[PDB]
Symmetry: C2
Subunit: 202 residues, 2 copies
């Protein structure tokens, strides 16, 4: 099962008509209002808020003290709805501080356990996160570029991509943008931190 | 001397008509094509412009005559090479990066983390990232004072590397807070005209942002 979470980024970055994206929807802050405005009934709304009307059929989660509403929404989704995956929409564009918080959200030890189950999606990008190990990914038909992004120090190996790396160490965050798949699949291995993999298009 | 650098990001994120922005212009990759298209004569161009379209070859070649043309090297991205070349040949006091946001996320993070390289780190204090809703500044360890940008509403402290960060007078505060990985402390705000902060290591990014009032007013 997949739960869709909508945060407050610009609508111009949505990959498609949200009513077109299947799966239960959850909205945080502005995200909830935009889901409602689109006639979408959320299974859960996070924040302090037709709304009251849409909230009867939804699990309402008020803001707390230790979490951002986005972090709270993520934590609440996995603990209460318990899906296999959460697709984050509205997480890019606009305010950069929100964007970066969304991208580095899984670094916090409490949310890292879910890194493998969280994906950011917008019209030009798909973002997945990985924990140390060996993996195989497949090219997304509509994407041209592939990028490996170490969010923390690690030894990264890319044995079969257009550009490769042999247990390369990064002492700080780095974005190896503009790589590409040789064929339809590719492998990668790393021994620490968290790795973000981004497939993008123009 | 403010040197403006335009990279390949979406034009929708520009903060204004590029021709209204003062200071010499440098274009990297697609950025160069966009400057030429707007009638802006770049003082320098960085990127491979020889395997580009015949339809656009001559027209770009005409604009490149009066510009310093820097060819890609083997060690740097074109954006990094542009930054290195600017400090090397244009005697700038500050470098303002435009077109560094939106679009592809791998390029965006690359622009945000560019100054982390030990070599480029010496220029972090002089590189400012600018788009429609944001203005990003970078700092090296020490104590600082900043003021609120007139059009900005939000303030954010973004440690890019492990450090102890102290925020004593902002809406929200931190007392030697430690981060073991990059963190974006978003939505803080100035409490007064100025704000201060101190940190002991790594590189700190500071972001002043605003909402897109126009777009929000449409919903």
């Amino acid at each position: 099962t997949i739960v869709n979470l909508l945060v407050g980024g610009p609508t111009a970055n949505y990959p498609a008509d949200l009513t077109t994206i299947p799966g239960p929807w959850v909205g945080a802050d502005r995200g909830a209002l935009r889901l409602v405005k689109r006639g979408i009934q959320p299974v859960m709304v996070v924040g302090d808020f037709t709304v009251k009307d849409a909230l009867v059929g939804a699990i309402v989660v008020k803001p707390d003290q230790d979490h951002t509403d986005t972090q709270l929404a993520i934590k609440s989704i996995f603990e209460q709805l318990q899906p296999d995956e959460v697709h984050l929409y509205g997480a890019t564009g606009g305010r950069l501080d929100h964007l970066l918080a969304n991208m580095w959200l899984v670094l916090d030890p409490v949310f890292r356990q879910w890194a493998p189950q969280i994906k950011l999606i917008d019209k030009q990008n798909s973002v997945r996160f990985f924990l140390p190990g060996d993996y195989q990914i497949t090219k997304e038909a509509d994407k041209r570029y592939l990028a490996f992004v170490p969010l923390m120090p690690m030894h990264l190996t890319l044995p079969d991509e257009k550009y490769q790396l042999d247990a390369a160490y990064n002492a700080y965050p780095i974005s190896w943008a503009s790589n590409e798949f040789s064929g339809n699949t590719g492998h990668f291995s790393f021994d620490a931190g968290v790795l973000a993999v981004i497939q993008s298009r123009d």
